[PDB]
mmCIF file of all heavy atoms in Angstrom:
data_model
loop_
_atom_site.group_PDB
_atom_site.id
_atom_site.type_symbol
_atom_site.label_atom_id
_atom_site.label_comp_id
_atom_site.label_asym_id
_atom_site.label_seq_id
_atom_site.Cartn_x
_atom_site.Cartn_y
_atom_site.Cartn_z
ATOM 1 N N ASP A 346 -51.564 -35.372 -15.860
ATOM 2 C CA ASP A 346 -51.289 -34.153 -15.103
ATOM 3 C C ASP A 346 -51.256 -32.927 -16.017
ATOM 4 O O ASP A 346 -50.533 -32.919 -17.016
ATOM 5 C CB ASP A 346 -49.951 -34.292 -14.366
ATOM 6 C CG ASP A 346 -49.857 -33.409 -13.131
ATOM 7 O OD1 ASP A 346 -50.202 -32.214 -13.212
ATOM 8 O OD2 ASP A 346 -49.428 -33.916 -12.073
ATOM 9 N N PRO A 347 -52.051 -31.890 -15.686
ATOM 10 C CA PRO A 347 -51.999 -30.630 -16.433
ATOM 11 C C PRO A 347 -50.732 -29.809 -16.157
ATOM 12 O O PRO A 347 -50.451 -28.850 -16.882
ATOM 13 C CB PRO A 347 -53.242 -29.882 -15.939
ATOM 14 C CG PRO A 347 -53.489 -30.416 -14.580
ATOM 15 C CD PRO A 347 -53.066 -31.854 -14.614
ATOM 16 N N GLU A 348 -49.983 -30.190 -15.124
ATOM 17 C CA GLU A 348 -48.757 -29.492 -14.732
ATOM 18 C C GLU A 348 -47.506 -30.261 -15.157
ATOM 19 O O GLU A 348 -47.542 -31.482 -15.327
ATOM 20 C CB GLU A 348 -48.727 -29.263 -13.216
ATOM 21 C CG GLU A 348 -49.892 -28.448 -12.654
ATOM 22 C CD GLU A 348 -49.793 -26.957 -12.950
ATOM 23 O OE1 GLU A 348 -48.677 -26.454 -13.209
ATOM 24 O OE2 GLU A 348 -50.843 -26.282 -12.916
ATOM 25 N N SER A 349 -46.403 -29.533 -15.318
ATOM 26 C CA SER A 349 -45.110 -30.123 -15.657
ATOM 27 C C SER A 349 -44.566 -30.987 -14.506
ATOM 28 O O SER A 349 -44.933 -30.769 -13.345
ATOM 29 C CB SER A 349 -44.106 -29.022 -16.015
ATOM 30 O OG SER A 349 -43.762 -28.250 -14.878
ATOM 31 N N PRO A 350 -43.697 -31.973 -14.825
ATOM 32 C CA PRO A 350 -43.072 -32.839 -13.813
ATOM 33 C C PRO A 350 -42.293 -32.095 -12.720
ATOM 34 O O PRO A 350 -41.908 -32.702 -11.716
ATOM 35 C CB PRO A 350 -42.124 -33.724 -14.639
ATOM 36 C CG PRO A 350 -41.972 -33.032 -15.950
ATOM 37 C CD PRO A 350 -43.272 -32.346 -16.186
ATOM 38 N N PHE A 351 -42.073 -30.797 -12.915
ATOM 39 C CA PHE A 351 -41.348 -29.971 -11.951
ATOM 40 C C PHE A 351 -42.284 -29.201 -11.016
ATOM 41 O O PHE A 351 -41.841 -28.633 -10.015
ATOM 42 C CB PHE A 351 -40.403 -29.010 -12.681
ATOM 43 C CG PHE A 351 -39.306 -29.700 -13.449
ATOM 44 C CD1 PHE A 351 -39.487 -30.056 -14.784
ATOM 45 C CD2 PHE A 351 -38.086 -29.985 -12.840
ATOM 46 C CE1 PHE A 351 -38.473 -30.691 -15.499
ATOM 47 C CE2 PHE A 351 -37.064 -30.620 -13.546
ATOM 48 C CZ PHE A 351 -37.259 -30.974 -14.879
ATOM 49 N N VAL A 352 -43.573 -29.188 -11.351
ATOM 50 C CA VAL A 352 -44.593 -28.529 -10.535
ATOM 51 C C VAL A 352 -45.576 -29.566 -9.977
ATOM 52 O O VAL A 352 -45.795 -29.629 -8.764
ATOM 53 C CB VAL A 352 -45.351 -27.427 -11.333
ATOM 54 C CG1 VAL A 352 -46.316 -26.675 -10.433
ATOM 55 C CG2 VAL A 352 -44.371 -26.449 -11.979
ATOM 56 N N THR A 353 -46.151 -30.368 -10.876
ATOM 57 C CA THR A 353 -47.051 -31.499 -10.553
ATOM 58 C C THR A 353 -48.404 -31.110 -9.930
ATOM 59 O O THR A 353 -48.602 -29.972 -9.497
ATOM 60 C CB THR A 353 -46.360 -32.609 -9.693
ATOM 61 O OG1 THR A 353 -46.223 -32.171 -8.336
ATOM 62 C CG2 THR A 353 -44.989 -32.973 -10.255
ATOM 63 N N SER A 354 -49.328 -32.069 -9.905
ATOM 64 C CA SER A 354 -50.645 -31.875 -9.298
ATOM 65 C C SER A 354 -50.898 -32.843 -8.142
ATOM 66 O O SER A 354 -52.024 -32.950 -7.647
ATOM 67 C CB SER A 354 -51.751 -32.013 -10.351
ATOM 68 O OG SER A 354 -51.695 -30.963 -11.301
ATOM 69 N N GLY A 355 -49.850 -33.540 -7.705
ATOM 70 C CA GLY A 355 -49.994 -34.542 -6.656
ATOM 71 C C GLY A 355 -48.785 -34.761 -5.772
ATOM 72 O O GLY A 355 -47.691 -34.269 -6.056
ATOM 73 N N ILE A 356 -48.998 -35.501 -4.687
ATOM 74 C CA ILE A 356 -47.918 -35.909 -3.787
ATOM 75 C C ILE A 356 -47.924 -37.424 -3.565
ATOM 76 O O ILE A 356 -48.985 -38.035 -3.414
ATOM 77 C CB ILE A 356 -47.951 -35.154 -2.426
ATOM 78 C CG1 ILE A 356 -49.361 -35.157 -1.818
ATOM 79 C CG2 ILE A 356 -47.429 -33.727 -2.596
ATOM 80 C CD1 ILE A 356 -49.408 -34.848 -0.329
ATOM 81 N N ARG A 357 -46.735 -38.018 -3.562
ATOM 82 C CA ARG A 357 -46.584 -39.452 -3.343
ATOM 83 C C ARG A 357 -46.283 -39.729 -1.870
ATOM 84 O O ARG A 357 -45.413 -39.092 -1.273
ATOM 85 C CB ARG A 357 -45.481 -40.017 -4.242
ATOM 86 C CG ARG A 357 -45.347 -41.536 -4.207
ATOM 87 C CD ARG A 357 -44.153 -42.015 -5.018
ATOM 88 N NE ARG A 357 -42.892 -41.448 -4.538
ATOM 89 C CZ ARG A 357 -41.684 -41.867 -4.905
ATOM 90 N NH1 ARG A 357 -41.548 -42.879 -5.757
ATOM 91 N NH2 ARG A 357 -40.603 -41.279 -4.409
ATOM 92 N N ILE A 358 -47.019 -40.674 -1.291
ATOM 93 C CA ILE A 358 -46.879 -41.008 0.127
ATOM 94 C C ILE A 358 -46.735 -42.519 0.318
ATOM 95 O O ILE A 358 -47.542 -43.294 -0.195
ATOM 96 C CB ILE A 358 -48.075 -40.471 0.970
ATOM 97 C CG1 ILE A 358 -48.226 -38.954 0.798
ATOM 98 C CG2 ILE A 358 -47.901 -40.821 2.447
ATOM 99 C CD1 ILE A 358 -49.588 -38.402 1.204
ATOM 100 N N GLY A 359 -45.701 -42.922 1.051
ATOM 101 C CA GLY A 359 -45.484 -44.324 1.403
ATOM 102 C C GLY A 359 -45.481 -44.543 2.905
ATOM 103 O O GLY A 359 -45.247 -43.609 3.676
ATOM 104 N N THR A 360 -45.736 -45.783 3.318
ATOM 105 C CA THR A 360 -45.841 -46.125 4.741
ATOM 106 C C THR A 360 -44.711 -47.018 5.254
ATOM 107 O O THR A 360 -44.628 -47.286 6.454
ATOM 108 C CB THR A 360 -47.190 -46.797 5.063
ATOM 109 O OG1 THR A 360 -47.426 -47.867 4.138
ATOM 110 C CG2 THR A 360 -48.324 -45.786 4.982
ATOM 111 N N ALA A 361 -43.844 -47.464 4.347
ATOM 112 C CA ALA A 361 -42.760 -48.394 4.675
ATOM 113 C C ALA A 361 -41.824 -47.902 5.783
ATOM 114 O O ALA A 361 -41.427 -48.676 6.657
ATOM 115 C CB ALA A 361 -41.962 -48.737 3.419
ATOM 116 N N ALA A 362 -41.480 -46.616 5.740
ATOM 117 C CA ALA A 362 -40.549 -46.022 6.699
ATOM 118 C C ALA A 362 -41.146 -45.905 8.102
ATOM 119 O O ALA A 362 -40.528 -46.328 9.081
ATOM 120 C CB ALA A 362 -40.066 -44.664 6.203
ATOM 121 N N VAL A 363 -42.350 -45.339 8.188
ATOM 122 C CA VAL A 363 -43.028 -45.135 9.472
ATOM 123 C C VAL A 363 -43.423 -46.449 10.162
ATOM 124 O O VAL A 363 -43.459 -46.519 11.393
ATOM 125 C CB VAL A 363 -44.253 -44.173 9.355
ATOM 126 C CG1 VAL A 363 -43.789 -42.737 9.146
ATOM 127 C CG2 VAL A 363 -45.198 -44.601 8.237
ATOM 128 N N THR A 364 -43.703 -47.482 9.366
ATOM 129 C CA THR A 364 -44.058 -48.808 9.881
ATOM 130 C C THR A 364 -42.867 -49.484 10.567
ATOM 131 O O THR A 364 -43.036 -50.177 11.574
ATOM 132 C CB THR A 364 -44.619 -49.718 8.765
ATOM 133 O OG1 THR A 364 -45.701 -49.053 8.102
ATOM 134 C CG2 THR A 364 -45.128 -51.034 9.335
ATOM 135 N N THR A 365 -41.672 -49.272 10.016
ATOM 136 C CA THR A 365 -40.426 -49.760 10.612
ATOM 137 C C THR A 365 -40.212 -49.139 11.997
ATOM 138 O O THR A 365 -39.716 -49.799 12.913
ATOM 139 C CB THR A 365 -39.211 -49.460 9.699
ATOM 140 O OG1 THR A 365 -39.461 -49.972 8.383
ATOM 141 C CG2 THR A 365 -37.933 -50.094 10.244
ATOM 142 N N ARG A 366 -40.606 -47.874 12.134
ATOM 143 C CA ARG A 366 -40.478 -47.135 13.391
ATOM 144 C C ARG A 366 -41.463 -47.589 14.471
ATOM 145 O O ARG A 366 -41.222 -47.377 15.662
ATOM 146 C CB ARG A 366 -40.620 -45.631 13.142
ATOM 147 C CG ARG A 366 -39.373 -44.986 12.553
ATOM 148 C CD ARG A 366 -39.504 -43.474 12.494
ATOM 149 N NE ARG A 366 -39.703 -42.886 13.819
ATOM 150 C CZ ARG A 366 -39.886 -41.590 14.053
ATOM 151 N NH1 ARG A 366 -39.894 -40.718 13.050
ATOM 152 N NH2 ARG A 366 -40.061 -41.164 15.297
ATOM 153 N N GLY A 367 -42.570 -48.200 14.051
ATOM 154 C CA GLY A 367 -43.569 -48.726 14.979
ATOM 155 C C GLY A 367 -44.939 -48.084 14.859
ATOM 156 O O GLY A 367 -45.797 -48.282 15.721
ATOM 157 N N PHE A 368 -45.141 -47.320 13.788
ATOM 158 C CA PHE A 368 -46.409 -46.635 13.540
ATOM 159 C C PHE A 368 -47.491 -47.628 13.121
ATOM 160 O O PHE A 368 -47.274 -48.462 12.238
ATOM 161 C CB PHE A 368 -46.239 -45.559 12.460
ATOM 162 C CG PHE A 368 -45.623 -44.272 12.954
ATOM 163 C CD1 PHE A 368 -44.522 -44.279 13.811
ATOM 164 C CD2 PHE A 368 -46.145 -43.046 12.550
ATOM 165 C CE1 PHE A 368 -43.959 -43.084 14.261
ATOM 166 C CE2 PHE A 368 -45.588 -41.849 12.991
ATOM 167 C CZ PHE A 368 -44.494 -41.867 13.848
ATOM 168 N N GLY A 369 -48.649 -47.530 13.768
ATOM 169 C CA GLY A 369 -49.786 -48.397 13.475
ATOM 170 C C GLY A 369 -50.972 -47.631 12.922
ATOM 171 O O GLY A 369 -50.840 -46.474 12.512
ATOM 172 N N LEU A 370 -52.134 -48.280 12.927
ATOM 173 C CA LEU A 370 -53.368 -47.725 12.358
ATOM 174 C C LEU A 370 -53.800 -46.400 12.998
ATOM 175 O O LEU A 370 -54.339 -45.526 12.317
ATOM 176 C CB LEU A 370 -54.508 -48.751 12.448
ATOM 177 C CG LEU A 370 -54.282 -50.174 11.914
ATOM 178 C CD1 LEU A 370 -55.409 -51.095 12.354
ATOM 179 C CD2 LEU A 370 -54.125 -50.208 10.395
ATOM 180 N N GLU A 371 -53.556 -46.264 14.301
ATOM 181 C CA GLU A 371 -53.881 -45.048 15.052
ATOM 182 C C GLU A 371 -53.077 -43.846 14.559
ATOM 183 O O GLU A 371 -53.629 -42.763 14.347
ATOM 184 C CB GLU A 371 -53.632 -45.257 16.551
ATOM 185 C CG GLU A 371 -54.476 -46.356 17.195
ATOM 186 C CD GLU A 371 -55.970 -46.084 17.118
ATOM 187 O OE1 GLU A 371 -56.388 -44.924 17.334
ATOM 188 O OE2 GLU A 371 -56.730 -47.036 16.844
ATOM 189 N N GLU A 372 -51.773 -44.056 14.383
ATOM 190 C CA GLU A 372 -50.852 -43.033 13.894
ATOM 191 C C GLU A 372 -51.178 -42.597 12.467
ATOM 192 O O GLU A 372 -50.940 -41.446 12.097
ATOM 193 C CB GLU A 372 -49.405 -43.537 13.968
ATOM 194 C CG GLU A 372 -48.801 -43.574 15.377
ATOM 195 C CD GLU A 372 -49.253 -44.769 16.211
ATOM 196 O OE1 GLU A 372 -49.869 -45.707 15.658
ATOM 197 O OE2 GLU A 372 -48.982 -44.769 17.431
#
């Protein structure tokens, strides 16, 4: 990353939470 850990160049995304709620492939 060319940016500091406080600015960053990316976002982290997980599916564990939404899957518990009932989110599928369509969502």
Side-chain angles (χ1 to χ4, degrees):
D346 205 313
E348 301 285 338
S349 69
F351 296 91
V352 185
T353 75
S354 293
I356 48 162
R357 187 185 59 168
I358 303 162
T360 50
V363 288
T364 307
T365 307
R366 283 187 60 182
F368 280 44
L370 309 168
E371 299 299 318
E372 285 78 11

